[PDB]
Design a protein around this ligand. Structure first.
Ligand code: LFA
Ligand code: LFA
Ligand code: LFA
Ligand code: FE
Ligand code: FE
Ligand code: FE
Ligand code: FE
Ligand code: FE
Lengths: 164, 164, 163, 164, 163, 164
């Protein structure tokens, strides 16, 4: 027996598909930074793409652990171009803020259904989203310090190029 | 800047997107095997999914190496249900045979324009595709021997569960 | 004592339920031993030990908040089941009952704003997810098995390897 | 099938359930010493409780080795309070003596049936009971010398806290 | 800043409370040193360093959520107690007050559906259980010691061994 | 017995309370640098705060080593804001020069009282304060050479981030 309500399963399945989209979006930002020729920003976006995949697989495993099933949905085409580096990263910040709210919505729905297991499972994402937001604000802050000066952009490129 | 024709850039970009669908398709086969409860087949499909991402990224890299740019397209919703194990693996073989012909088409197009670099690049894929088909055919030959017998299916599950 | 008497009693009741759970799994070891499945015996003995550690975590938490543990009688558990599948079906049902009892303590602790006990119980919520699932995974393998002895022996070996 | 008499199987099964009661009793003495705030005594009682489980399991294995089956019985509520350290260890001693006599009774019953296999099996427990009784007499005799001096009780709590 | 001004202010105040907590344990060390108990001194100095890490945890969380930290004046703490037992009950009473301050932030965050701050505070809810319990254990040992100097020396070495 | 005069004990206790404020002050500059987004300057200042605590603790011990007693006084509120990176470090230099003079005042009080022990104990801080002053001056000079050019600011931000 599936021991999550169907409406919590679809909320989880929906979030799983949003995590797949988030990974595709960062790959698309990588395509942008690669066209712009910043190998370090490219490197950073590829790691973010694979990191979001692990988020999706976390949802994957919990759905099956609670007796549900996963259904993959179509993945909409992401933007392929931005108005500069600050533009791409602010789009990332806004995006992760949307992801956090979508996860917040699942938590409140689970809490209202007295689904304590799903409430507890999502705490990892609550904490993780704090870090996903902060790291992008850090880059945005450093980018505003550079203020388009290429000597500093190279430093920030090579800094983000070291992400493991 | 770009030293591939737009006809070859577009064939490569389209194949890149098909490799992304390939990974999504194999992930969806994992959701099916998880629903049916075959951990080894799940494992095998998850590893196939990650192999297809590397196929995509080899196209990604080659496009930029020749001065092109990659544009990510929508990913269609993959099927989530099959009649049984053998049908899923037959769907995989059909898929890989289809990707082989699509690569054959890029190779013939590149050869037509005397883009010898892209012809040579696709040789790796010609050789990889022979093994992608053969591995699925070996499984199908075993499933046809298994003939739906659960004790023998369980052996093949554990066997494909050992994939590295 | 810094837990309410009503929460202290709930924890103490759950400690005794956790000891009963360990005894129950020992009784399933007695059953599989009578039936001659060494691997299922192994799994059940390892499961009985795991419930003891659960009980002791309630033990320690009660004393950490100024409480005292009172051990109650342990009811006689069933000693027989109608085959391997039936015993694991009883296990799944039992663990679900354990999950609901933990949920109930968590809800009582929440409405008393006993945040320490709420947070303490999170560990058991997450653990209960696994205990339910690992029995569900066994049941699904048994359903496919359909009593076929070659597959049951394969499953005895798999469960005999639990550490 | 079973090569112990039903009368000896019942005697062994009964004693297995006494061993489980013994471990529960000692756990209960741990609950008492934990309320009293003597860490070392708690540790000792927890170690004694685990030791009685190895006793129960030893009977378990012999019963199955002789073609018998184990049936677990209800476990009585143990006392949860004593009138002091000496009183608790005195109850432990009295309990171990009762266990010894219960074990002796099985030995005499099996020897009257010429069930030599069960006679020989029980030798291990005859010897163990000598140690179990002696270890409690040792503690009681040290407590007599302590004579309520908290400085010496602390020393003794530390010593029994070192039990491996 | 993505925490509300009431939640940032509660967090900033708790940061300053943690710093006073570290200062308080430091003068408790000044007390035990005047009284000539090196082990209790050692224990109190270690408690001081631990409270700095509590403060620094609130520090980091405030910045991770886009807020800023403002350091406030630190009150002069008591410098004397009328004995070992009195010093530790001041410690216990204080940690209980810290727990309630943390509970208030938790409920404030919860009413604001600020799940991130709620979850961040779980670590402290769990930590405070152990901070209270370790002082209770010490007090319970001091009651057994009952002013006997030979036993006080024993407890002095024990707490002197804290890592 | 106390073998320092009350005025030298009182001077030493004031310096102890002054050393704690210095640590609190440097902690507050970290709050400033963290708000400005300079993680390396934050690192430097947090480690400077820990060094001031060790200064406090050396006064702590010496007071007890000559039979006195420490009384902790209120810590008066530090500033939390500066008009830029170098202005903060200008405050740092200004502060430690004040500490050096406060230490000099104790040394003279000790010299006139023929308290040779306190005179000698303080020569550690005399020598340490020379380092403390030079350490900030050198930072100040590089900030002036950098001249607000962030590529150079970023570089010694990372430089001071390497402090042990
Ligand atoms: C460095 C390359 C990153 C590319 C990310 C592409 C994301 C969008 C397409 C998703 C395809 C399916 C995901 C496969 C997951 C494989 C299973 C992982 C199990 C832990
Ligand atoms: C391997 C077989 C396990 C059988 C368990 C039967 C449980 C019945 C209750 C008996 C009392 C158990 C007391 C256990 C004390 C353990 C303390 C460990 C340290 C925290
Ligand atoms: C070294 C052993 C004694 C420690 C006593 C600590 C007393 C603290 C009093 C308040 C001081 C506040 C400023 C401390 C900043 C420390 C920052 C640490 C980050 C690494
Ligand atoms: Fe994510
Ligand atoms: Fe492929
Ligand atoms: Fe025994
Ligand atoms: Fe604290
Ligand atoms: Fe200093």
């Amino acid at each position: 027996m599936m021991v999550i309500s169907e409406k919590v399963r679809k909320a989880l399945n929906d979030q799983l598909n949003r995590e797949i989209y988030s990974s595709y979006l960062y790959l698309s930002m990588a395509t942008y930074f690669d066209a712009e020729g910043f190998k370090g920003f490219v490197h950073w976006m590829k790691k973010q793409a694979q990191e979001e995949l692990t988020h999706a697989m976390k949802f994957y495993e919990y759905i099956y652990d609670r007796g549900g099933r996963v259904e993959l949905e179509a993945i909409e085409k992401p933007p392929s171009n931005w108005n500069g580096i600050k533009d791409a990263f602010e789009a990332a910040l806004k995006h992760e803020e949307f992801v956090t709210q979508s996860i917040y919505n699942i938590l409140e729905l689970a809490s209202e259904e007295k689904d304590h297991a799903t409430v507890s499972f999502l705490k990892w994402f609550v904490d993780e989203q704090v870090e996903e937001e902060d790291q992008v604000r850090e880059i945005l802050d450093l980018l505003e310090k550079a203020n388009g000066q290429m000597s500093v952009i190279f430093q920030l490129d090579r800094y983000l190029g070291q992400r493991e």
